[PDB]
Every structure is written in structure tokens, then in C-alpha cells.
Symmetry: C3
Amino acid sequence: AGRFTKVAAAVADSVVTIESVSEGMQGSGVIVDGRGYIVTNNHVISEAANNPSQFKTTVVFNDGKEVPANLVGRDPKTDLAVLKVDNVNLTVARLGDSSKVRVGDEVLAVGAPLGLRSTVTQGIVSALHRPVPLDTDTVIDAIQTDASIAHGNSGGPLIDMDAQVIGINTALGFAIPVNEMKLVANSLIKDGKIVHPTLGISTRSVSNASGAQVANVKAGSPAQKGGILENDVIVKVGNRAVADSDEFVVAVRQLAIGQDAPIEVVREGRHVTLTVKPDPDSTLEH
Amino acid sequence: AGRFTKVAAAVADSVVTIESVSEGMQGSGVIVDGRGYIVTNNHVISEAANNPSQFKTTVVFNDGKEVPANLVGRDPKTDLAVLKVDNVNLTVARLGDSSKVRVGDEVLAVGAPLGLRSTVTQGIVSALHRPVPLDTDTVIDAIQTDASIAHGNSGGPLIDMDAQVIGINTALGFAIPVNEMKLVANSLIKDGKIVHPTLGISTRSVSNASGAQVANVKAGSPAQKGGILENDVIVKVGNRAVADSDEFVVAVRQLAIGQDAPIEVVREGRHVTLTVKPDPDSTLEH
Amino acid sequence: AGRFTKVAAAVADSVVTIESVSEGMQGSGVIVDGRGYIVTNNHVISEAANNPSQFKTTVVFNDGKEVPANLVGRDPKTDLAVLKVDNVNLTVARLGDSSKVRVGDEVLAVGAPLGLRSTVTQGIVSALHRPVPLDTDTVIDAIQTDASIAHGNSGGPLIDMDAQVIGINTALGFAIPVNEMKLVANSLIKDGKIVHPTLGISTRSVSNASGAQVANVKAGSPAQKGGILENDVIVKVGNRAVADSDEFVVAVRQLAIGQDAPIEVVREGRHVTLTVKPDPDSTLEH
């Protein structure tokens, strides 16, 4: 048994096929809780959550066993989604620590074994916390990897050499970190819904100071009250520095809701600093 | 000497350049028999076997030595082909076992060293027995690998870590399993020709039960006598289950010729079961 | 710490971000001399050397420290370029030996860590001395690798397993060998300019003898005096054999300037042999 052959064998029973039929779409997912909670990506079941009348998500295990599915919740802003299999034994995956992942580590982008176009690709960690563009469109602070990510392993986990989940694949290959995955899944399980910060700002990238040049501020938004104007260039949102519009959408998510936060920007070349109170995007869930 | 550096060095003298000139086309191949039998893929020499008057296939070894070639036989249905070098010493490759290959094993997609666009790529086994579409067109029950397969290593072997051939490259990278390779090469050497099963059925894929929806049945075919109609959906051919039209063409090849075999299909949603006697595709060679 | 994780960690401080602003363009480079000499590729700073009035190349280290840059020299014919950081401590990279590199060795295509689209890809050596086509356009006798080369690691080094530079990345992935890199950088530092051989010949590829069919000979060139005509097919330039026009441009560079050299060619199918005295491309620097 080789190095990568043993890792894919242990975690295989913890990887699952996810398919919604009507047509049809198929994907992958990982078993993260013994109660029957399976984590996938939102675009896999995105067609099962916008059309619930003509679709029926099913769960195919590694041993061929089928079972119905139950959508616990999803998060299109970080492209995560949690499913439920009631009264199923269950091979629980081992969840890793994304903060301990370093550039250079060997990883495995596992897909569901019984899948039609399943993959199992191997690479290393090419980048950490890379904002990548990807139901509302979004951008994620992802783990980059030279292991190929396609329809096969999309949904499946990004496994380290200790057979532990360092991320969840999404579709030069990118994965959502496991630490951002656990936080979203822990509040998608409990609260059935996540609440992300918001400032009400449409931005565009620039490369001249660079950053996210503001396009349109929402009327009544926290940004409109903190003094952010159009045409200024956001160079730092809070403790994070903003390199372009892709990193701008990711920086606002790490801001505490209600806590007044600083936002540095350059308007007419002149560097101003701006205080904003991040609103919740879900006024009914917060 | 590294791990992959030693494997490619031992098997290098067993990998060969194959080139037909007139324009011209070049490829790769492996030495599998001491008598001078070299295995390649059919599309490499496909232009040397349909135009034998304006072409002349030649064999370039790792030590630069050239020699003429002799087409023993080919199989476009599994994209295999065997050549012959008379009175040549000869580095015989070690043939592996495809059934022992597991997802995760490190592999090497070797190409002919002296080739113009030669490659030597490294990956793992991404999938086993994946029907892939690819002279009559066909589909093969291939070994998938994340190692790149291109014009360089096309023809060359897919080598495991024990420096043993687990497959032969063909042109997200796919290879023909060595066990299906040996069987085809053993009867392409002896009988000079392979004979594959046939039922006389044109099929199309569907994803609603799914499977291979039948398009046109050949008049007088075994399928026309066993009761298979048009518009029904083939869900299983024999002991194999049919997921789409690509897997359908692969399942019929494993059926014994003359032996009555079952074929389950759904016509008007109603699941019927059908007995068919697979014909040989070569009535003169069987 | 994994195998590839330790190699990328040691050499990380020796890899540098290179950016010219006005927009703007960013790249990568390696620290090869303690005096502050940083090597990159010419197309990275190509916009900083043709437009010096509206651009300002800057150097960002791994520890975030910025510093201005100083163009010591560049070579578009082998796509190399050397920069200068005065009075900077400095993590000097360990330079490897390209002649000791064998097909199969694990390599790391490192990019600048703080880069916007930085990569760190891992592969093996797929080919040695592969002429690849790539300010005057050119072709290089490059190291091929299955590790992905993109805008991220372009400029950065191709690191072996001993944390030593075997090449410099350029943009199925290719790198300029470190031995050809040192020679160009040693005379780009000293003489501020490289001088490459020239014969005055425009060639085109052919695959029938094959080689580089001559298109246009420059009036007064060494080729026009040694007896090379148009329409003949160059099959060998010196000790090198010419397989196509891409290898032809690389073979002339290894010829000594002034030393009469042989050039074998086939005109009307008849094999002639031709003596040429390679001119310097820079009559003022030689």
C-alpha cells in the first residue's frame, strides 16, 4: 500500500455521492457528524434548493447503499451546504486544522467513489487564503492546490497526509478551508442559517494606490453613513488590506456585526480613514 | 537517485519511439516480448495501416538505434496495436497486474526518450474502469490518472512504482489497463486479429431510470431477435450495469460469444428483461 | 513538516516579488547574489525596460519589506533578466547544476509568496533540453516539467529536492536551465550585456530528410558567405542535429563566434556540407 493509496482508502467510506434527480445533477460530499450530517458545496444541491418540487436529493455511500437526503442549510456566500441522513453505520471523517496547513503539503482531492465522473487527484498546497471568484455569486478565501478540481471531486474533501480534512473542494484547483467550513457548518446545523456582515458597497478593481474602487453605495447602508463615497479606492477594510475587488468581498466577512470598524480609502489621491458599523445581511436571523 | 527518477531510468530502455514517414507522425510504444513484439496504440500507426503504400513505420530505441517495423495487428475497439522488430539486445518491460491497481498509487506516464515532443509525467490513479470516449470510434474501460497524457507519452506505458506496466497511455489522463492489453496482444500476436462481441444496437445516453436509450437496432442482429426494441432504456447488460451509452459499448465486450446473456431494460417505464446471444463482429475470424 | 513543505520554506525568503507600476505588472524572481543581484525573466520587466519613463520596478521580499530595483541587464534571446537591490539582510539562494538533473526528479515551481496570483506547484522533470517557442521572440533549450507554470511562479525558480535552483520558470511547464542561467547572469552582471552568435538565416520546419528549411538568408551574413542557399533543409548545425526550426535557433547559440563551424544541409535531396563563421549579433559589444 502506497502513501496516497492508504489515505484514500481510509477516507473513502467517509466520502459520499450526492445526486438530485428529476434532468439530474451529481456531486460529492463528506461525512462530518455521526448523527448523519453531510457537508457538500452549494452549487451541487443549488438545483435541489431552488426547485424542491421536481427534485429529490439522494445519498449514495461507498458500499453502494442509498438513502434520502435532507437539506439542513446552505451558504452561497462561502459556497457551503449541509445535508442530513437520519438513522443510518456511519464513517465520520476526521476534521483537520486549516491554520496548520502550509504551502508544500501533499493533499488529496477526493471524490465520491461510485460517482459517474469521479476523480481522485493529488497535488500540493499552492497558496493559502487566495480570494477566488465563484444563488448569489461570491468570492472565497480558499486554499489553492495544483491538484485538479473538477466535477468529480467537487464537493469532496481536500485531505492531507494524515487522512484529515483540510478543506472541501469547490468548482488551478481551489478548496474552502476546513476552519471556515466548520464555523459555517456549526451555525448552519444549529441556527439553520448563517448571517454574514454587509456594508452596502459595489466595488471594482484597479491597478495603478490600488485596491477596490467603489462603484455604487446602497442608500441607507452602513458605508453610506460612515462617509464612504463613490469613486474612492478602498485600500484596507479593518485589519485586512484590500488588493482588489475580490479580496474586498472577503475582508468584509471577517468584520464583527455592530462593532464599529475602520476602513481606509484614497479619494482624489488623498488617504482618508472611515468608520463603519457592519450591518447583518439577514435582519430577521440576527 | 530519486524515487521517480529510478523508475523512469530502468524502464527507459523498454520504451520506444514509433514513427511513420511519407507527411509523418510519431508516437511511443513499449517492448513487451523478447522476440521483438512492441505494443503501441492504434491511432499512432492508424495512418500507417490505412495507407501502407506511402508510409514506412520505423522503430527508434533509447540508444538511438533505428530498425524497420512490422504491423502484427491492431484493435481499434480497444485502441491497441502490436508491431514487430525481427533479430534485434532487447530490454523487455515488466508487465503488471491491472486488477491489483488501487486508486492512490503513484504512476508514471512514460514516453519515448528520443521523441520530439516526449513527456514523462507523474500522477496517481484517479479512477478505475472509467468508460471514456475515444478507424471505428470506440470507448475503453480505462485507468484514469491526474498525470498528463499528451502526444508525447501517448503510446508509452503507465508505470507503477515497482517499474511495472499497469497500462498503456492513449490520447484527465487515461490509459488502457495492462490486463486488457495482454489479452488483446496475446490474440493479436497469435491469431493476428481480435474478435469482439456485438449485439447490433445504437444507443444514446439519458439522465432522468437512466442508462443507454436505444436508437437503432440492426436488422438481423442478436438484439433484434432477443426482443430489444427502439426507445427502451438499457439499464444493465449482463452482470454489468449500464450508466450511459459510453458504459454500454464497454459492457457488451465482456459478454461471451454465443452464450445467451441477459439484458435488462425499461420500456415505457416498465422494467423488462431480455435474453440475447452475442454475435461475433468478425464472422470470418471466429 | 512534509518533504515539499520543508523545501518551499527554506527557499521562500530567497524568492522575491517583482512589480513595475505606472497600469502595472507583477512577477517573481530569485536572490542569487549577496550583493543584491536578483534574477527574473525578461518578459516580467520587459515593460519596465522599453518604457522606463512611466514605470518604476519595485522589489517586495518575503518579510513584506519593499525596496527599489535597478535593471542590470536582460537577454530576450534566452528570456533572462537581472535586477539590483543596493544595501539590503539577504537570503542568497543555492544554485544547482542543470547537467545533473535527470528525468524523474521531483521539482518545485516556486513563486513569490506575497504575490497577488502566486503559485507553488509541484511536479517532476518531464523532459531535458526541449526547444520551446516563446522584444525579439526566441526559443530556449528549456527544462520541461509537469508542474504548472503560470503568471504566479513565472520568474521564480524551479527547485529540486535539495532546495537548490535547477532552473528559472518562464511563461506543459517549462523552465530555463540554471547552467544557462548562470552563464547569462555572469556576463549580464559583468559586461552588462550578452552577445549571442548569429548566422543570418530565416528557417521553417518540415516533416517529410526533415529539419529547418531555409526561408531567407540575410545579405552579407555568414550563411550567405559559407554557401547556404534558400530552400535547402538544415539537418545539423555544428555538433547539434536540427529537428525543426525551433531547435535550429537553439543550435546556433552554442556555436563559437569567429570559429569556422560545419553546417550539414540537404538541397534537392542531395546532402551538402557547409562551413560558416558565426557572427556576433552585437558588433559593438564583441
